[PDB]
Design a protein around this ligand. Structure first.
Ligand code: BCL
Ligand code: BCL
Ligand SMILES: CC[C@H]1c2cc3[nH]c4c(c3C)C(=O)[C@H](C(=O)OC)c4c3nc(cc4[nH]c(cc(n2)[C@@H]1C)c(C(C)=O)c4C)[C@@H](C)[C@@H]3CCC(=O)OC/C=C(\C)CCC[C@H](C)CCC[C@H](C)CCCC(C)C
Ligand SMILES: CC[C@H]1c2cc3[nH]c4c(c3C)C(=O)[C@H](C(=O)OC)c4c3nc(cc4[nH]c(cc(n2)[C@@H]1C)c(C(C)=O)c4C)[C@@H](C)[C@@H]3CCC(=O)OC/C=C(\C)CCC[C@H](C)CCC[C@H](C)CCCC(C)C
Ligand SMILES: COC(C)(C)C(=O)C/C=C(\C)CC/C=C(\C)CC/C=C(\C)CCCC/C(C)=C/CCC(C)CC/C=C(\C)CCC=C(C)C
Ligand SMILES: COC(C)(C)C(=O)C/C=C(\C)CC/C=C(\C)CC/C=C(\C)CCCC/C(C)=C/CCC(C)CC/C=C(\C)CCC=C(C)C
Ligand SMILES: COC(C)(C)C(=O)C/C=C(\C)CC/C=C(\C)CC/C=C(\C)CCCC/C(C)=C/CCC(C)CC/C=C(\C)CCC=C(C)C
Ligand SMILES: COC(C)(C)C(=O)C/C=C(\C)CC/C=C(\C)CC/C=C(\C)CCCC/C(C)=C/CCC(C)CC/C=C(\C)CCC=C(C)C
Ligand SMILES: COC(C)(C)C(=O)C/C=C(\C)CC/C=C(\C)CC/C=C(\C)CCCC/C(C)=C/CCC(C)CC/C=C(\C)CCC=C(C)C
Ligand SMILES: COC(C)(C)C(=O)C/C=C(\C)CC/C=C(\C)CC/C=C(\C)CCCC/C(C)=C/CCC(C)CC/C=C(\C)CCC=C(C)C
Ligand SMILES: COC(C)(C)C(=O)C/C=C(\C)CC/C=C(\C)CC/C=C(\C)CCCC/C(C)=C/CC[C@H](C)CC/C=C(\C)CCC=C(C)C
Ligand SMILES: COC(C)(C)C(=O)C/C=C(\C)CC/C=C(\C)CC/C=C(\C)CCCC/C(C)=C\CCC(C)CC/C=C(\C)CCC=C(C)C
Ligand SMILES: [Fe+3]
Lengths: 44, 273, 51, 325, 255, 44, 51, 44, 51, 44, 51, 44, 51, 44
């Protein structure tokens, strides 16, 4: 097992789950904002 | 991440104000009260510069220019799009520079050193404040300061130099230029001598201070010593800064004609036939 | 989303709170000053012209 | 307050130090005789002398004296050999380069011959001094850093006086020997070829000059602030690290995020100073031979600022308003 | 003059070549300055996961005088301290350390010393460089005020003894240390003070960094005729630690 | 379990609860201010 | 890929989180400022014109 | 075997497999974006 | 091609990952900016003209 | 319980009560001042 | 030609790889830029004129 | 044998094999690109 | 003649290789550019004024 | 024997023998280049 940071496999999986949840929430908010802006003033 | 010898110096205490409310590090950087103020002022100034750039119409680093107001505004506040932004950024910059100096003082106190570095930085701060505060105040208008642009703040220097015709004839400018040249020459010589002592030709032992003293007495007949050279370098650099400030401050409020005319006192002394 | 409380096992609140405090006040000052440099939303000049 | 270590509190004096020696036998050419100055002892060493006399030093001294005397006697003859008027106009006189109509040919003594003879003597003197500085380091069994940094300034010297006039094809491109007259040459050179501000190598040269002054301020202050830990003995700190070096490094690491070593700061200093004349000479050599108007060059390469407002005083005020009528 | 393509002339080519050269020079200069204190560690003493953008340099060798051998850098930190009386104030990184006992006596904080060699520094002849004035041939005071015989004043205003001698640097003709003789009420024996922490007046010598009760714990020299590098580091660190540890008000915020 | 700060699970949960209580109050105040400003001078 | 979680065995999350926060804020500010330098997408000027 | 970094063969194989997965996903997204852009406004 | 994985026995993954992360963003930003400097591929000016 | 300053729970509650009292008094004075100023010379 | 593998007994691969990467990218960028300064091979202007 | 880098002959042979594979793949892609470009707009 | 192998007893094989690599690339670049400067051997402009 | 680099006679012989093959191949490519260039556009 290779580890530069001292973490373990299970710890990395547990951290990645929450990180991905945060990423998806951020992306959903950005998508809604972009759709509202496109309806307001189209750029395509 | 710390250096191999760094942990035993990272103790608590030695703050002018704040205590341990801000006594920590972020990476290699030390944070304090003045670190917080520095961050606030510097970030606000940079963001305001970029807002002014967006409202100007160009993001080219060579072409961005934020300028002071017209002379008809005097010492009052101008509209933000006609010179007020420059005034706000000037206030931010002064705050940031003072915070940087006080942070250096706190670091010096924590490490148990002398306060030579903040004192030396104070002279550069003084020159900047003379350029943007004292001279416009004496001349009566905020519009006498230089603009904030990489290539537009050279046009200001050019036009200000040619408004006294031949600026090389300013005696204080002569003194400042001489100090600059001498400081550079001394730095070159000092670095060269130390490197030559520490790095002899291949297969040779290293040298000591006696060897350096001998090289310079053989070379020119005098040696200043390993303690005198640092004093001399510091004094030369500080004199350069001080005389630069003096030379700029006498050009506007004290002398109005061209600078060659000043030497008429020498050209017409009674002692001559 | 229900495990977002675990950020405090990564970061100490003492540094985070000062960072957030600096950031929020910086943002507020910047936005108010940006509004003050337009014509339509400068309330000081609007009050003067309206009189 | 605490002692700041700018002037020495008390001085001591012992036997004069005649210097070290080796198989090269440096003592053979050294003068005998030393002095002590208590006025300069407040800031540095008090001992004066001795000095080394070689062939290169004597040749350099003689040729430099000859150059000085030629310039001075020409200036004296230009005024009628009147000593009071020679003193009255000292700062305004000069020995002038030849006229543009002679090309690279030998001109008459009246119109540049003395200038050429003086230039030859000055060149010989400077090259002999550089040879002396190289030979001394060779005989002391040390590195050759001093000679290489003197050669970097000699490069700009030679470009100003020898290489560029040859490339342009006229000895009339050199600098007059005088005080106010060489500051007139600087300004006229800047005006003739556009604006020297918009020469990128002039800007690089300014960068390095400013940086070298900043670096010396920083290094002097830092070494003076760790002298209470014996920081001024730099070589022993390089050979055996102490707490002075650690405190000096940690100050700048906590200030700006990175630092140097006791030996590595001198490399930074050496490069910032030497890079000034090199970039300056490159910039000077490109002017007139490649580029003839630097502001038009900047316009072509799109880094010249543009101004919207108008020119003239009548767009801002009135002549009566300025006078207060 | 003509252009190769577009506006490209000799000046542009020279500028780009200088850009490349300067990048290489910056790399070299930064790498040359990483010969002491690497690799980096965390606050628990373990190697850090992050090491930076620049790789470590190759090894160079010095040849020392008077038969001390060679020095190769970068290498192992031979000036490292072994047992430090320090404690952590947080479970993570980035927070200060707290002294366990007496910081002035334990050599931590601003009172820190480095482990230098236990031998005196030599001059070109191979003799000890710093010598007491009583054993220097032909030396004497030439200017300024002679401090020998004057009383010594502490930082809190107490008289602790008298100046008995001066230790000078023969090669450079400079005074390095002041030697004191302590009164029985304030300790026994003799102590040294560096010249850079004293002020010489017409009737007294003033030392402001430490107090009267701190003078008996100044580290002493092993021999009455010479001092080693370790001893000097330990003595000067002690005097500098008092600027923060002598009084409780010197450590708390000034406001 | 992974903990760089030394806190436990329950301590982190308490801290997050109080932090989000602060965040929501800040957001409600800002929403009221934005609504009043839009009624005064619309930007859409 | 289901093995992407191993990025945290190479990078420290504490430094990556700080870098990501700085990068994201700077990018958002850059985009918002690029929009305001045009005539078609400057909402302050559009508000002024519509009155 | 020769190894400048300290890893073994299996660790290198695993690291390269995950790196290749990431590269392929990045390239696929870039290809879709390029095709949409070409449909909107064709070069060549 | 089946032995390309040996590159990780030569280069440290952390430095390589950081350098690639910087390089890719700089390249993408440069390409978008180069597109914006033309007349045929500037989408803001196109949106203004089409309305 | 978690504590970085050395205070207890009861002491923190007791201090917060007085701090809130001071904050409310300051806010009341500011409100009266703002009302008087608006009556004299209204913005908005 | 069968003994060309001995170049790695003289040069260290770690430095060679970095130098080669920098050289290849700089060369490709320079060639692409040189192509864009002409008129017969500028694909942006060719696309603009074609439409 | 002669070695300045610290490798053996077998390691050098293996490294050169992998390097040559990479070089040939790069060259093949470049050749296909050059052929497409020449068809699109011939030089010479 | 056949004793030319002895050159490697004087010169270090590494730095001579580096110097030849640099000199050869610079020579090739300069020759290509000098050919581009003329008119009969410029292939971009000849291709332009051919079709 | 004189050797300013430390290599032996056989090592120098082998190094030169390898170097000359690369020189000949580099020259051989250049001949084919200069032979096609002449046919395309002669300079003599
Ligand atoms: C036509 C032009 C005239 C002329 C016009 C002027 C005028 C007008 C001026 C001088 C000034 C100067 N002239 Mg003159 N001068 C001319 C020709 C020359 C020549 C020559 C021919 O070789 C020389 C050598 C000089 C040189 C000089 C110096 C004596 C002096 C520079 C000021 C200085 O260094 O202050 C250094 C101090 C500072 C201002 C620096 C302040 C630094 C601050 C405190 C720190 C900022 C931090 C920063 C934001 C951080 C960024 C980094 C982070 C990562 C973000 N002049 C010609 C003939 N000269 C200037 C002067 O003396 O002004 C004071 C000046 O105004
Ligand atoms: C109107 C004036 C023009 C201008 C005209 C020029 C010209 C012309 C030149 C400079 C040059 C320089 N300019 Mg400019 N410059 C201007 C304004 C400025 C300003 C400013 C406004 O702030 C600054 C800071 C500078 C600064 C500088 C320096 C960075 C640079 C000189 C290099 C050097 O190391 O000098 C140090 C000087 C030397 C090392 C000369 C050589 C000395 C030798 C070694 C002496 C030998 C010994 C001697 C013969 C023996 C003595 C005898 C003893 C008694 C024993 N310029 C304006 C725009 N500038 C120079 C340069 O390099 O330009 C690219 C140059 O030629
Ligand atoms: C800024 C660096 C330049 C320089 C300066 C310089 N020259 C110097 C000194 C200095 C700082 C001396 O201190 C030393 C000297 O004694 O000056 C009075 C000297 C000297 N080196 C010299 C040579 C010399 N160095 C040269 C080079 C240079 N040295 C650099 C260009 C050159 C040139 C320009 O080419 C020459 C011609 C003479 C100028 C002078 C001769 C000194 C000597 O022969 O031996 C040492 C002195 C004695 C014999 C004993 C004392 C007698 C002194 C000559 C007079 C002063 C005595 C008085 C009691 C003290 C007053 C204070 C002094 C500081 C003036
Ligand atoms: C890196 C570039 C910087 C630099 C570097 C530099 N200069 C150097 C060196 C170095 C590294 C030397 O080693 C060399 C030196 O000797 O330094 C002590 C020097 C030097 N730089 C000098 C000048 C100089 N450098 C300058 C600039 C710079 N030097 C740059 C800022 C400048 C300017 C314009 O800024 C000047 C004017 C000299 C002091 C010295 C070179 C000395 C030399 O070559 O002398 C030749 C000899 C003669 C011409 C004989 C002159 C005869 C005199 C008429 C009388 C005899 C001399 C006497 C001592 C003077 C009079 C004394 C009176 C009391 C009588
Ligand atoms: C338009 O263009 C320009 C550039 C001009 C812009 O304006 C651009 C603007 C942006 C890009 C803006 C971007 C803005 C953001 C990303 C904003 C983000 C804001 C937040 C995340 C805000 C969060 C606020 C959270 C708060 C206030 C939380 C808590 C506060 C508390 C007081 C809670 C206190 C907690 C305690 C005491 C816990 C104690 C508990 C124990 C158990 C000890
Ligand atoms: C037109 O002319 C001009 C000059 C204007 C141009 O625009 C010219 C442009 C060019 C010449 C451009 C050239 C561009 C390139 C050569 C680009 C090359 C790009 C790449 C090779 C990109 C590769 C990206 C690869 C990625 C993202 C792969 C993987 C990432 C990850 C897998 C992240 C996850 C990693 C983990 C989990 C580590 C696993 C760890 C373990 C321990 C198993
Ligand atoms: C027209 O005129 C002008 C001036 C405008 C020009 O444009 C002039 C242009 C030139 C003069 C151009 C000249 C160009 C060249 C000389 C180009 C040369 C190019 C190469 C030699 C390219 C080589 C590329 C090699 C590659 C890509 C190799 C890749 C290898 C690998 C990916 C494998 C890596 C190896 C490993 C992992 C070893 C295994 C490890 C172990 C531990 C066993
Ligand atoms: C218009 O645009 C520009 C930019 C020009 C602006 O002007 C913008 C301006 C802003 C963005 C401004 C923003 C301003 C704020 C965020 C302001 C916030 C202000 C506060 C939170 C104020 C709080 C004040 C609290 C006070 C005064 C509390 C208490 C005071 C006491 C005296 C209490 C004393 C307590 C005791 C004795 C406790 C002791 C108890 C024991 C048990 C010992
Ligand atoms: C670094 O130091 C060391 C020691 C390692 C070195 O010295 C290393 C050196 C190298 C690694 C060098 C590498 C060198 C190269 C990779 C060189 C490569 C060279 C080429 C690929 C050259 C190609 C040249 C092609 C030319 C000139 C083509 C010209 C074509 C025409 C003029 C078109 C004419 C039309 C024709 C022939 C019609 C064709 C019709 C048919 C029917 C086939
Ligand atoms: C404008 O026009 C004018 C005419 C002015 C010019 O431009 C003028 C131009 C000139 C005057 C040009 C002159 C050019 C030359 C003199 C060129 C000379 C070129 C060479 C001698 C080239 C030699 C190339 C050799 C090569 C490529 C050999 C080998 C390369 C290898 C990569 C293989 C080497 C491998 C080894 C040694 C393995 C090591 C083995 C062990 C056992 C350790
Ligand atoms: C138009 O042209 C120009 C140049 C103007 C452009 O605008 C060009 C622009 C670009 C090229 C832009 C490119 C932009 C990107 C590539 C953006 C990428 C952005 C991301 C990948 C963002 C990701 C964000 C992810 C986040 C926020 C996820 C999660 C955060 C958290 C979950 C925080 C909580 C974490 C916890 C609790 C972990 C702790 C867990 C334990 C188990 C302890
Ligand atoms: C008469 O009274 C006495 C006896 C007391 C005197 O002697 C008095 C003397 C004076 C009062 C003298 C005063 C002298 C000056 C004020 C001199 C000033 C001199 C300068 C400012 C000189 C600057 C010189 C040079 C400059 C700026 C640059 C470059 C120059 C050179 C590289 C010169 C080298 C020349 C060469 C190589 C050309 C040689 C030609 C050949 C064909 C070999
Ligand atoms: Fe130094």
């Amino acid at each position: 097992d290779l580890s530069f940071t001292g973490l373990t496999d299970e710890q990395a999986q547990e951290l990645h789950s929450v990180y991905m949840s945060g990423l998806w929430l951020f992306s959903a908010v950005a998508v809604v904002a972009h759709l509202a802006t496109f309806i307001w003033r189209p750029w395509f | 991440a710390l250096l191999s010898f760094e942990r035993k110096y990272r103790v608590r205490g030695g703050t002018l104000i704040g205590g341990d409310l801000f006594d920590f590090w972020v990476g290699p950087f030390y944070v304090g009260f003045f670190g917080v103020t520095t961050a606030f002022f510097a970030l606000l100034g940079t963001i305001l510069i970029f807002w002014g750039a967006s409202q100007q119409g160009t993001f080219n680093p060579w072409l961005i220019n934020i300028a002071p107001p017209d002379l008809s505004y005097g010492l009052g506040m101008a509209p933000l799009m006609e010179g007020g932004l420059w005034q706000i950024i000037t206030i931010c910059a002064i705050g940031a520079f003072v915070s940087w100096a006080l942070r250096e003082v706190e670091i010096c106190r924590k490490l148990g050193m002398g306060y030579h570095v903040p004192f030396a930085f104070s002279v550069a701060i003084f020159a900047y404040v003379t350029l943007v505060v004292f001279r416009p105040l004496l001349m009566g208008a905020w519009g006498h300061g230089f603009p904030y642009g990489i290539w537009s703040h050279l046009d200001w220097v050019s036009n200000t130099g040619y408004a006294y015709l031949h600026f090389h004839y300013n005696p204080a400018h002569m003194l400042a230029v001489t100090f600059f040249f001498t400081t550079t020459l001394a730095l070159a010589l000092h670095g060269a001598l130390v490197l030559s002592a520490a790095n002899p030709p291949k297969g040779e032992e290293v040298k000591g201070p006696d060897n350096e003293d001998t090289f310079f007495r053989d070379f020119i007949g005098y040696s200043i010593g390993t303690l005198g050279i640092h004093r001399v370098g510091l004094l030369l650099a500080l004199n350069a800064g001080f005389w630069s400030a003096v030379c700029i401050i006498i050009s506007g409020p004290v002398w109005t004609k061209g600078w060659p005319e000043w030497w008429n006192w020498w050209l017409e002394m009674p002692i001559w036939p | 989303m229900s495990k977002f409380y675990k950020i405090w096992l990564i970061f100490d609140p003492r540094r985070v709170f000062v960072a957030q405090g600096v950031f929020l006040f910086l943002l507020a000052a910047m936005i108010h000053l940006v509004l003050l440099s337009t014509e339509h939303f400068n309330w000081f000049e609007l009050a003067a012209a309206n009189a | 307050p605490e002692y700041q270590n700018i002037f020495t509190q008390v001085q001591v004096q012992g036997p004069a130090e005649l210097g070290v020696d080796n198989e090269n036998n440096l003592t053979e050419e050294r003068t005998t005789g030393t002095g002590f100055s208590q006025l300069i002892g407040w800031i540095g060493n008090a001992q004066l002398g001795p000095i080394y006399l070689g062939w290169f030093g004597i040749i350099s001294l003689v040729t430099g004296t000859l150059w000085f005397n030629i310039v001075g006697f020409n200036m004296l003859s230009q005024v009628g050999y009147s000593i009071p008027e020679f003193i009255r106009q000292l700062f305004w006189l000069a020995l002038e380069p030849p006229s543009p109509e002679y090309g690279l040919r030998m001109p008459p003594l009246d119109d540049g011959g003395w200038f050429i003879i003086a230039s030859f003597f000055l060149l010989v003197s400077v090259i002999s001094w550089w040879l002396r500085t190289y030979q001394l380091a060779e005989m002391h069994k040390m590195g050759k850093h001093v000679a290489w940094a003197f050669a970097a300034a000699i490069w700009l010297f030679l470009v100003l006086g020898l290489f560029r006039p040859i490339l342009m094809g006229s000895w009339s491109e050199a600098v007059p020997y005088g005080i106010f007259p060489h500051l007139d040459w600087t300004t006229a050179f800047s005006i003739r070829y556009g604006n020297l501000y918009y020469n990128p190598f002039h800007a690089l040269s300014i960068v390095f000059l400013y940086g070298s002054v900043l670096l010396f301020a920083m290094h002097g202050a830092t070494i003076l602030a760790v002298t209470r830990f014996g920081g001024d003995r730099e070589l022993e700190q390089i050979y055996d690290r102490g707490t002075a070096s650690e405190r000096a490094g940690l100050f700048w690491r906590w200030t700006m995020g990175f630092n140097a070593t006791m030996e590595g700061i001198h490399r930074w200093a050496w490069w910032f100073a030497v890079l000034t004349p090199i970039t300056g000479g490159i910039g000077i050599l490109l002017t007139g031979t490649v580029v003839d108007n630097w502001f038009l060059w900047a316009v072509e390469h799109n880094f010249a600022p543009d101004y919207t407002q108008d020119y003239g005083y009548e767009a801002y005020t009135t002549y009566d308003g300025f006078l207060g009528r | 003059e003509e252009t190769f393509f577009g506006n490209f002339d000799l000046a542009s080519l020279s500028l780009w070549l200088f850009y490349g050269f300067f990048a290489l020079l910056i790399y070299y200069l930064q790498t040359e300055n990483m010969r002491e204190g690497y690799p980096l560690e965390d606050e628990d003493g373990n190697t850090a996961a992050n090491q930076g953008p620049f790789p470590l340099p190759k090894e160079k060798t010095f040849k020392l005088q008077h038969g001390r051998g060679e020095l190769t850098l970068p290498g192992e930190d031979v000036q490292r301290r072994d047992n430090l009386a320090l404690r952590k104030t947080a479970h993570g990184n980035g927070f200060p350390m707290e002294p366990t006992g007496d910081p002035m006596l334990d050599g931590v904080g601003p009172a820190s010393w480095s482990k230098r060699r236990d031998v005196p520094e030599l001059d070109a002849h191979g003799h000890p460089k710093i010598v007491p004035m009583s054993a220097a041939e032909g030396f004497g005071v030439s200017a300024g005020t002679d401090p020998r015989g004057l009383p010594v004043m502490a930082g809190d205003g107490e008289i602790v003894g008298l100046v008995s001698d001066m230790w000078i640097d023969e090669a450079e003709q400079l005074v390095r240390y002041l030697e004191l003789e302590l009164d029985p009420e304030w300790g026994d024996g003799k102590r040294l003070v560096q010249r850079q922490m004293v002020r010489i007046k017409s009737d007294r010598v003033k030392v402001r960094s430490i107090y009267g009760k701190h003078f008996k714990n100044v580290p002493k020299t092993k021999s009455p005729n010479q001092v080693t590098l370790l001893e000097e580091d330990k003595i000067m660190a002690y005097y500098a630690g008092g600027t923060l540890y002598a009084d409780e008000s010197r450590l708390e915020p000034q406001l």
